[PDB]
């Protein structure tokens, strides 16, 4: 995943 | 006729001799070795035995005796000595040879304040019982004499007043493992602890001194080197200085960028008196650098960076030149001259180079690192503007002057700033690379501080580790090792403490790592390649693609699990750009090896899930960690087959790995006919490396007419370096046998 | 340490390609  | 020889023990005093005990021990230590004479050793140590000598001296003497026989022709003496030392050190710490149970040892050490108390909080007696089953104290027998000397001297937990040693190498490794994976889910925690423990105890992964000596103890300071960038203001100068002082107090190597400090003569910026220029501040940084060292000169190292076109460049370039007025010399700091394409081109076309104070040419400094087009535009513009204070120098004079000083001191380094930004993991428009660290291997984003606790400042750090190319069998063992190296360092990032707010900011923001190799030379010798003929180009290409591919795969795997670094959006990685897309084009002409890995799969996997860490590789030198593994240093060819070290315990010798079979395979440093071979290899490695490589240039006067190295050759090697995309150039070595 | 001959030829360099 990539933070948000 | 009962002529005995009374040995004295640790306040248990008197007792008769036991020369048969000694022989047994010796005989044991020799087990498996070839060409070592136990008799020889006994002869040489028994002769210095005197009536009431303590047992501890019997061990020292037998140890030295063995150590003094170390040679190229009898290399197993290093193990015979090491094992004797290991044996002695067991008795010294435990009273027996057999290490206590892990739990017991950890408990005892925690009561004594030598180990962090959190170890017992984080792990159950049963969990310690289990780690103990992973441990193999027999691996202590694989260290070479110099390695034990190092562990004994600067790794094992000990009392430096009394001299008492409290632990054994295997506890070191097992607890380093445990601390770094302490926060893992019970489900996987101990599988990781074991995997890593193995990796480090069997020398596949090397770890920096601060880590090896500290993790497991109460400290939280593990910094090897920091990178600070000074703004053109007393506030920043002050802050920079303050930061340096805190950091040298913790033994860190300092890389300072002081290129924006306005030149001497420039106007007072309402209160800030920079009429006096750069030097006075440089001097101030040097005292700051040396503030926590021995006399006011011994220990505390730094490298200061500035653009080649800075207005005081000619005064700057000769700061370490000993023949000069004391006021105009800052000799105990190395300098890093920053160059780009346009500078070189001016050299090539025999044209002039215009010097400017950064204060006077709006946009020029930023453009210099981030956009070459713009730099060219602003540069030519400002050359024509007669309002702008400037000075002209024939490019040849300037280059020679720099190379001259580089030649004489060996410590005037180069940094190719375009290369650092056109071929980097970062977007130059948002987080450019505008400096390196002390040994010119680290390349990371930095922002100037306005106060020591400024939260909008950024300091880059050195989070390091290395793969032993000598201990892997195939490059596919790097996938497992990349996982372990990346995971352990990433944990360290959250484990350790940050003395300055701006240094936490960078670590938590970009989670930058610098993992490199050691044992390169020995690796090339096993594969029958050499450095100077270009025979190792494709193998090097194959080996660095494997290193970088698996490091990105491990970091990608980690972002999936725990989230990409906060500022992953500032990397080129985030925009689907890979090292294989931005490398210096000319490399195509010196290596045909094809990528063997799915970079396109990884490209998408990175774009989608991101990277835990913004940078993952950097090739640093590493004398100490290399020594522990009996390995050649980083990527450098050895000076000779036997290297010598001084000690209080006598001369320490270490023979290059597998000298027996590979003496003709090695290419010693002064056997290389010149630097082309090596620079080509560095350029190839640079294809895949996120940061930079500490690359050296070496010249031997014997090879030149009248024993003088031509300035031509120096410039030719410099341009060769730039042509194959080399980012930095570190030391220059001169001589023909050392 | 380093003892050099400071004679430089631009003509030779000229033809180099960065």
Swiss-Prot record, chain B:
One of its GO terms (biological process) is deoxyribonucleotide biosynthetic process. One of its GO terms (molecular function) is protein folding chaperone. GDP binds at residues 209, 437, 441, 623-625. It comes from the Bacteria. The active site is at 437 (proton acceptor), 439 (cysteine radical intermediate), 441 (proton acceptor). The record marks 730-731 as: Important for electron transfer. It catalyses: a 2'-deoxyribonucleoside 5'-diphosphate + [thioredoxin]-disulfide + H2O = a ribonucleoside 5'-diphosphate + [thioredoxin]-dithiol. It is an enzyme of class 1 (oxidoreductase). The record marks 225, 462 as: Important for hydrogen atom transfer. ATP binds at residues 9, 15-21, 55, 91. Under complex allosteric control mediated by deoxynucleoside triphosphates and ATP binding to separate specificity and activation sites on the alpha subunit. The type of nucleotide bound at the specificity site determines substrate preference. It seems probable that ATP makes the enzyme reduce CDP and UDP, dGTP favors ADP reduction and dTTP favors GDP reduction. Stimulated by ATP and inhibited by dATP binding to the activity site. In vitro, its activity is increased by dithiothreitol (DTT) or thioredoxins (non-specific). The modification N6-acetyllysine is found at residue 283. Changing residue 731 to F: Loss of activity. GO terms for cellular component: cytosol; ribonucleoside-diphosphate reductase complex. PROSITE patterns: ATP_CONE, RIBORED_LARGE. Belongs to the ribonucleoside diphosphate reductase large chain family. Provides the precursors necessary for DNA synthesis. Catalyzes the biosynthesis of deoxyribonucleotides from the corresponding ribonucleotides. R1 contains the binding sites for both substrates and allosteric effectors and carries out the actual reduction of the ribonucleotide. It also provides redox-active cysteines. E.coli produces two separate class I enzymes. This one is the functional enzyme during growth. Two distinct regulatory sites have been defined: one controls substrate specificity and the other regulates the overall catalytic activity. A substrate-binding catalytic site, located on R1, is formed only in the presence of the second subunit R2. This is Ribonucleoside-diphosphate reductase 1 subunit alpha. It comes from Escherichia coli (strain K12). The lineage of its organism: Bacteria, Pseudomonadati, Pseudomonadota, Gammaproteobacteria, Enterobacterales.
Curated annotation (Swiss-Prot), chain C:
Induction: Induced 4.2-fold by hydroxyurea (at protein level). Transmembrane segments: none annotated. Belongs to the ribonucleoside diphosphate reductase small chain family. Tetramer of two alpha (R1) and two beta (R2) subunits. The B1 protein is a dimer of alpha subunits. Provides the precursors necessary for DNA synthesis. Catalyzes the biosynthesis of deoxyribonucleotides from the corresponding ribonucleotides. R2 contains the tyrosyl radical required for catalysis. E.coli produces two separate class I enzymes. This one is the functional enzyme during growth. This is Ribonucleoside-diphosphate reductase 1 subunit beta.
């Amino acid at each position: 995943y990539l933070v948000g | 006729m009962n002529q005995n020889l009374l040995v004295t023990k640790r306040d248990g005093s008197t007792e008769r001799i036991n020369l048969d005990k000694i022989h047994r021990v010796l005989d044991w230590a020799a087990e498996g070795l070839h060409n070592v004479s136990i008799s020889q050793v006994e002869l040489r140590s028994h002769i210095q035995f005197y009536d009431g000598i303590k047992t501890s001296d019997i061990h020292e003497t037998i140890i030295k005796a063995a150590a003094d026989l170390i040679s190229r022709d009898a290399p197993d003496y290093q193990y015979l000595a090491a094992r004797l030392a290991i044996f002695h050190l067991r008795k010294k710490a435990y009273g027996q040879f057999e290490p206590p149970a892990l739990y017991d040892h950890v408990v005892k050490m925690v009561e004594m304040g030598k180990y962090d108390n959190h170890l017992l909080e984080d792990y159950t007696e049963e969990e310690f019982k289990q780690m103990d089953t992973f441990i193999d104290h027999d691996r202590d027998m694989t260290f070479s004499y110099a390695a034990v000397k190092q562990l004994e001297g600067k790794y094992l937990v000990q009392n430096r007043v009394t001299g008492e040693i409290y632990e054994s190498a295997q506890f070191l490794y097992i607890l380093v493992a445990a601390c770094l994976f302490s926060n893992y889910p019970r489900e996987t925690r101990l599988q990781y602890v074991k995997r890593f423990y193995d990796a480090v105890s069997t020398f596949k992964i090397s770890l920096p001194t601060p880590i090896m000596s500290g993790v497991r103890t109460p400290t939280r300071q593990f910094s090897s080197c920091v990178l600070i960038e000074c703004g053109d203001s007393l506030d920043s100068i002050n802050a920079t200085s303050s930061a340096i002082v805190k950091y040298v107090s913790q033994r860190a190597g300092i890389g300072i960028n002081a290129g924006r400090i306005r030149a001497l003569g420039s106007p007072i910026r309402g209160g800030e008196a920079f009429h006096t220029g750069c030097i006075p501040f440089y001097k101030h940084f040097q005292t700051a650098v040396k503030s926590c060292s021995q006399g006011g000169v011994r220990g505390g190292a730094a490298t200061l960076f500035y653009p080649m076109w800075h207005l005081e460049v000619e005064s700057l370039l000769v700061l370490k030149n000993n023949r000069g007025v004391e006021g105009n010399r800052v000799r105990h700091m190395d300098y890093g001259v920053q160059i780009n394409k346009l500078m070189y081109t001016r050299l090539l076309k025999g044209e002039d180079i215009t010097l400017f104070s950064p204060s006077d040419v709006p946009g020029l400094y930023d453009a210099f690192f981030a956009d070459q087009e713009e730099f060219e535009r602003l540069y030519t513009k400002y050359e024509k503007d007669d309002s702008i204070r400037k000075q002209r120098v024939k490019a040849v004079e300037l280059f020679s002057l720099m190379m001259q000083e580089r030649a004489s001191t060996g410590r005037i380094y180069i940094q190719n700033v375009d290369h650092c930004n056109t071929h980097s993991p970062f977007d130059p428009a948002i987080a450019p690379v505008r400096q390196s660290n002390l040994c010119l291997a680290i390349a990371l984003p930095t922002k100037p501080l306005n106060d020591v606790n400024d939260e909008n400042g950024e300091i880059a750090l050195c989070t390091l580790s290395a793969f032993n190319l000598g201990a892997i069998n195939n490059l596919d063992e790097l996938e497992e090792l990349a996982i372990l190296a990346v995971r352990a360092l990433d944990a360290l990032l959250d484990y350790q403490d940050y003395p300055i707010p701006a240094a936490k900011r960078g670590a938590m923001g970009r989670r930058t790592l610098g993992i490199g190799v050691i044992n390169f030379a020995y690796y090339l010798a096993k594969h029958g390649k050499r450095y100077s003929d270009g025979s190792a180009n494709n193998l090097t290409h194959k080996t660095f693609e494997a290193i970088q591919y698996y490091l990105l795969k491990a970091s990608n795997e980690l972002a999936k699990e725990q989230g990409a670094c906060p500022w992953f959006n500032e990397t080129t990685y985030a925009k689907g750009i890979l090292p294989i897309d931005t490398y210096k084009k000319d490399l195509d002409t010196i290596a045909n090896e094809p990528l063997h890995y799915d970079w396109e799969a990884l490209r998408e996997s990175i774009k989608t899930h991101g990277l835990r860490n913004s940078t993952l590789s950097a090739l640093m030198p590493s004398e100490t960690s290399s020594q522990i593994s009996n390995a050649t240093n980083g990527i450098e060819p050895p000076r000779g087959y036997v290297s010598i070290k001084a000690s209080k315990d006598g001369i320490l010798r270490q023979v290059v790995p597998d000298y027996e079979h590979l003496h003709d395979a090695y290419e010693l440093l002064w056997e290389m006919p010149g630097n082309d071979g090596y620079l080509q290899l560095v350029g190839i490695m640079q294809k895949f490396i996120d940061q930079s490589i500490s690359a050296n240039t070496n010249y031997d006067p014997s090879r030149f007419p009248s024993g003088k190295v031509p300035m031509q050759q120096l410039l030719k090697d410099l341009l060769t370096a730039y042509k194959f995309g080399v980012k930095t150039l570190y030391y220059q070595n001169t001589r023909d046998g050392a």
